[PDB]
From a paper:
Prokaryotic adaptive immunity by [name]‐Cas systems, which confer resistance to foreign genetic elements, has been used by bacteria to combat viruses. To cope, viruses evolved multiple anti‐[name] proteins, which can inhibit system function through various mechanisms. Although the structures and mechanisms of several anti‐[name] proteins have been elucidated, those of the [name] family have not yet been identified.
Structural and biochemical studies showed that [name] exists in monomeric form in solution and can directly interact with DNA using a positively charged cleft. Based on analysis of the structure, we suggest part of the anti‐[name] molecular mechanism by [name].
Residue numbers in the entry: 1 to 76
Amino acid sequence: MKAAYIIKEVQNINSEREGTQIEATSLSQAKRIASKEQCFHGTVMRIETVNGLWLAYKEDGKRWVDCQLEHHHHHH
């Protein structure tokens, strides 16, 4: 089944902008779509859920960085 993702192209890793709605059948496929859709040299592509959770992002010339998906809990 397709899932909804949001792809953002941002100037800086810790920047926020409106993204674009995509559908993809896996996170792997969403990453392929996001890299293909990059419009500007030197920006960061980020994949989020519709609820705004960071899933992964990629700077130019670097590999995808996968982000932590679970809510925090106390370890002590």
